[PDB]
């Protein structure tokens, strides 16, 4: 036949994997000692297009984005990871 070539081997590495495993533990220990952060983005936004840097609030006590809804009806059970349980 004509043949049947292929592609060079990808990039492997054990350290790259271990690094991720250890990194995870560190974050856990850091919080155990006291507390540093909660998530990679303190505030509400995720808006379309490029936006300004995440500047901390000026004695407001709320998320980055400013509330627009005047009358926000009462709602509950709105979370991605809800506290589950089992017998």
| Cβ atoms of 64 and 43 closer than 8 Å | yes
Alpha carbon distance 49, 40 (integer Å):
19
Alpha carbon distance 28, 44 (integer Å):
24
| Cβ atoms of 28 and 35 closer than 8 Å | no
Using DSSP's 3-state secondary structure scheme, residue 28 falls into helix
| Cβ atoms of 65 and 46 closer than 8 Å | no
- Which residues are within 8 A (CB) of 41 and not within 5 positions of it... i.e. 6 or more apart? 54
C-alpha torsion angle, residues 33, 35, 37, 38 (rounded to 10) = 100
| Cβ atoms of 75 and 66 closer than 8 Å | no
Nearest to 40 by CA among 51, 50, 54: 54
Nearest to 42 by CA among 30, 29, 53, 56: 56
């Amino acid at each position: 036949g004509p043949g049947g070539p292929g592609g060079e081997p990808g990039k492997g590495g054990a350290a790259a994997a271990a690094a991720a495993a250890a990194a995870a533990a560190a974050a856990a220990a850091a919080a155990a000692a006291g507390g540093l952060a909660a998530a990679g983005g303190p505030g509400q936004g995720w808006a379309p297009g490029p936006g300004p840097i995440t500047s901390i609030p000026d004695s407001l006590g709320g998320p980055f984005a400013s509330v627009l809804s005047s009358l926000q009806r009462p709602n509950g059970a709105k979370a991605a990871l809800v506290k589950s349980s089992m017998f």
